[PDB]
Amino acid sequence: XXXXXXXXXXXXXXXXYQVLREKAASQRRDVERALTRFMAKTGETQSLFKDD
Amino acid sequence: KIVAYELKTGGVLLHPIFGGGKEKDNPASHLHFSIKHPHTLSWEYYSMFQCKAHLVMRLIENRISMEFMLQVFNKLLSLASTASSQKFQSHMWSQMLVSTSGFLKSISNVSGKDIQPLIKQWVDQSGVVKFYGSFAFNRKRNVLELEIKQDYTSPGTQKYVGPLKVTVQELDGSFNHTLQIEENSLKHDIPCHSKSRRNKKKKIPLMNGEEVDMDLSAMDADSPLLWIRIDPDMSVLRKVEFEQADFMWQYQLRYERDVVAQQESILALEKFPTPASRLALTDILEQEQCFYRVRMSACFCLAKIANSMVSTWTGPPAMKSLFTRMFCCKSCPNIVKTNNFMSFQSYFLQKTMPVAMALLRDVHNLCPKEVLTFILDLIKYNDNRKNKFSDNYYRAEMID
């Protein structure tokens, strides 16, 4: 069958529900912290300690 | 509110009596003038003015039927609408001044009872009444039969209220109601239950309708009594202090038809105890259809009692299994995440419970580390617009 016949390729399955929504919530947390740092260092700033 | 403020400060009195002739006549002048003038009072005093107005109208419920009150109010608005919208009848127009005297006369014309003693008690003697109704136990195979003593003295801000009634629920039986007297160093009876013996056979002889409950777990050797109560319809401005067996308090929290009884047993079992059966019965009470805020204060019971589990850590780290066993999104593989709304039981409960989880502390460094990481993971797992309910207060109480 290595020479005559053939097959078909998909090459992408994970199917892990809890892992998928962990990845989605981690990406949401990353977007939160990224925009947090962005407009944290962008605009008018008052800190918690001195010069955070 | 009323007990808290009138134990902070003096009473909120409803004067018919003036201080005319440059007189004071004010025991309620612990701070300020109250008789003839609005703009001296405080908003604590003004709020408790409205609150005592609520509960004096509930005393008028407790002595006079609601239908008679509808008759009174229809008479008041009939005189008001007849006296209004006319050509200004001269000297015959002030019938819209329907103040306390003529209103009292209208009530007495509808139904004349002892409402002037109700005035001289609650309208004209601004006092919060505690209740040291000391439980005694007769018919513990005793000579005397089901007797309870009445006692009260607590000065500074006290008041002696006499003839009332007392509500006792039996094991499986009648609502026993018992009179009260003045001169409050008293002993009183109960209109006794039968001797409920062979209670393995007497499973449910009609507790309250068709309610289904079976426990010999109490001190049920010689105990036909379950619960003490003074005016469950909340007539008297009260702060009742007494003691029962702890099994009676915990059996009140499996089921009782009063949210008042549930949250007062919640407070009384927030004070002293720590068995694990208390935690079990609390978790049983939290998983039914009973009430919203009872379970809020029951999670606060779990908080206060698990704070007393420092050397007595018998159960698990609490309230994780309560989020596990009650919430299945897609059977929830160890984590509850998404779309738990449209049932406001679960909305208020998920709003409340992690606040009580953060109180769960045992004294090494108070170490809520599993709870901290679990709250961090809950803050991770918020929802999109599948919830159409603007997920704001859930975030706010998790930040709390």
Min Cα distance A28 → chain B (Å) is 8
Measured between CA atoms, how close is B380 to chain A, in angstroms? 6
Chain position carrying tokens 């006296």: B83
- β-pairing, B238-240 vs B148-150, is unpaired
3-class DSSP assignment, residue B293: helix
Residues of A in contact with B338 (CB under 8 A): 21
Q: Under 8 Å CB-to-CB from B345, ≥6 apart: which residues?
A: B289, B292
DSSP state for residue B135 in the 8-state scheme = -
How far apart, in whole angstroms, are the C-alpha atoms of residue B273 and residue B261?
A: 18
HSE-up of residue B363 (Cα within 13 Å, Cβ side)? 6
First to last CA, chain B: 24
Q: Do A18 and B382 touch (CB under 8 A)?
A: no
Q: CB-hemisphere CA count at 13 Å for B3?
A: 8
Q: What is the resolution of this structure in A?
A: 7.5
Experimental method: cryo-EM
| 3-state helix vs strand vs coil in chain B, percent to 5 | 40, 10, 55
> With left for phi above 0 and alpha for psi between -120 and 50, is residue B339 left, alpha or beta?
left
B326 SS3 class? helix
Alpha-carbon torsion, ordered A19, A20, A21, A24, to 10 deg: 120
The answer to whether B40 and B26 are in contact (CB under 8 A) is no
Neighbouring-strand partners of residue B186: B150
Distance, CA of B236 to CA of B157 (rounded, Å): 15
Looking at beta carbons, which residues of chain B come within 8 Å of A25?
337, 380-382
CA distance B26 to B18: 10
**Three-class secondary structure of residue B169 per DSSP:** strand
For residue B19, give Cα distances in angstroms to B16, B35, B125.
10, 7, 16
**Residue B110, φ and ψ in degrees, nearest 5:** -75, -55
Are B302 and B281 within 8 A, CB to CB? no
Q: Is the dihedral of CA B358, B359, B362, B364 positive or negative?
A: positive
Chain B residues whose beta carbon lies within 8 Å of the beta carbon of residue A28: 382
- Subunit contact B337:A29, Cβ cutoff 8 A: no
| Cβ-proximal residues to B211 (8 Å cutoff; 6+ apart), any chain | B204, B255
Nearest to B45 by CA among B9, B15, B16: B9
